[PDB]
Symmetry: C3
Subunit: 217 residues, 3 copies
């Protein structure tokens, strides 16, 4: 149903202690990165936000984060979901803390929102009031600055991004050119906290407008 | 059933009348691109051909055109389909003219053709007599020159491209190495309008030949 | 159920006896490559292993080898599967010999193994005791040297790879960073024949451990 919250789900979580030198080399780990926290979920962008949140809550870095082709609905195995994230830290304790902070955020109430009756169209419009070390890097902005995290299907995203850019004083920092691996699109926008929030609102409304009138132009 | 035309479908269309400066920068639009025309459909190569036809009928450029991973049958949302196209033009009126030309072409009888009983194998063998600005650029040929637009699943495409090249007086312009995002493959071949038609016929026959005998060397 | 062999299947095979120069150029064929052997199947890594076996059986080279997005289960057409491979040789006879070695290997009993009751988790832990020209080049090792060919879903793969590297004296040759086109991951590890086998065993064990306790 419209405006329903699509609940994201963690599918698998694992810890590597004393990561082997070979794997550390290929993941380009730092010298202090001795432990890894692995996580997969059925929603990549919520997970990406949760991972960034973890870097604030613990002494961990996001060293690896990638989405799966064609999304979670097209997963061929149980634990693949549509995202894998890897946190790196100095110890299993810190990594566990990072994963816990990640899990807490994923179940915090954030998520994609339905734009129609059968939830065949959904979107993400999340204001990050204070970015951690991951999403700030990704956006090419200063750590601690705010972001509007906007995601929707390709056409809806392009249409809604333009509405968001017009609704407030925000800069497009990173463009998720369609298709992402999951066949979505969108962007990270930056500005004041209230400006980012203003962008999120305009984005949500614009997506809903397209959903209710796909062929009208 | 074999030789049945598979009807392509448009899923969504929208017009942005005054693109924001931020969006124009990420799409690398020219200063004279003021309006955008967005379109999604369940068949990418038909849409690409339609978008190219639009550049001939109106003052519009194809500034964006991408396929979705794993094709329309695997779409996770209602309007994603397997392609997004973006026309850029001087005004909403001119963009609408371009979009109308696009929609007319998609509904003109072109499309993928079934190669077997249950339509589990299909191919695209379209002769573009006079390329617009988009496919000509993509093929690296002059606007107004002819193309054989040939697409099939990976093995069929490789087998049938070879047959088309031998059967007709054409040359290779652009190779769609398997897999495309939709897990197809093919090529754009150029030559006389007659030669391109001959390439299409030989391509189609060769794909059907593989469908009827997939395991025979 | 668990430990069941997931049977791999060839979907299509064709020979191009005399490849056109236009296609030869685009595939970057060697000047002596005149014939192509095309093959598709519903399991990419088995086919890659099989194609390597072909290079030992006939005068053929692997000139093309790609996986399909989202795997065989999401194929939109009958013969696409999740892999296309292309052998190139000086004659149709060499390609035929190559393709037949490929077919026989795929049907030899090799394949992904199931990790749980509904086979919703599977993995590949193949010990290649004697690499041909294809996987040897890909791994950056000498032809004839052994490989551990390890593949599993993203998290299982990363976890099991670490276990494998610790379980035996092996070096990482190529990393299949998640996702591959099929949304899998893994690596090629090298070492002695026994060292690679131990890595396969540790990998398989580690994947099954995750399957039976994913969240924990
Ligand atoms: C077919 C072929 C072969 C066949 C020849 C036998 C046969 N009947 O099939 C085989 C597979 C044996 C072969 C081998 C080699 N060849 Co050869 N071969 C070709 C090819 C594809 C076509 C020859 C042809 O039809 N020529 C045209 C017709 C009109 O002439 P022809 O006189 O009847 O052809 C004869 C000679 O070309 C000859 N031959 C073939 N290769 C070579 C190489 C050398 C150095 C010499 C002296 C003769 C020779 O055998 C042909 C008999 O049909 C060409 C590339 C091309 N598209 O032209 C390469 C080509 C001639 N080969 C080449 C090479 C490098 C080799 C090898 C060194 C490959 C290797 N093993 O490392 C060896 C040479 C030693 C040997 N003969 O085993 C190069 C030669 C360039 C140079 N450096 O002078 C070419 C030009 C390929 C390239 N790199 O572009 N070859
Ligand atoms: Na699917």
């Amino acid at each position: 149903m419209k405006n329903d919250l699509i609940r994201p789900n963690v599918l698998s979580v694992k810890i590597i202690s004393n990561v082997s030198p070979e794997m550390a080399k290929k993941l380009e780990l730092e010298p202090h990165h001795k432990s890894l926290g692995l996580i997969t979920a059925d929603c990549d962008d919520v997970t990406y936000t949760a991972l960034d949140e973890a870097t604030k809550a613990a002494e961990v870095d996001v060293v690896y984060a990638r989405s799966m082709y064609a999304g979670a609905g097209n997963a061929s195995t149980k634990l693949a979901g549509e995202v894998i994230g890897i946190l790196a830290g100095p110890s299993p304790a810190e990594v566990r803390s990072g994963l816990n902070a990640t899990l807490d955020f994923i179940d915090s109430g954030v998520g994609f929102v339905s734009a129609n009756e059968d939830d065949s169209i959904c979107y993400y419009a999340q204001c990050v009031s204070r970015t951690g070390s991951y999403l700030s890097k990704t956006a090419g902005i200063r750590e601690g600055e705010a972001l509007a995290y906007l995601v929707a299907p390709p056409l809806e995203a392009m249409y809604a991004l333009d509405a968001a850019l017009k609704a407030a004083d925000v800069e497009m920092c990173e463009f998720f050119a369609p298709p992402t691996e999951t066949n979505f699109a969108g962007a990270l926008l930056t500005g004041s906290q209230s400006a980012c929030k203003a962008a999120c609102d305009a984005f949500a409304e614009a997506v809903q407008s397209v959903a209710s009138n796909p062929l009208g132009f």
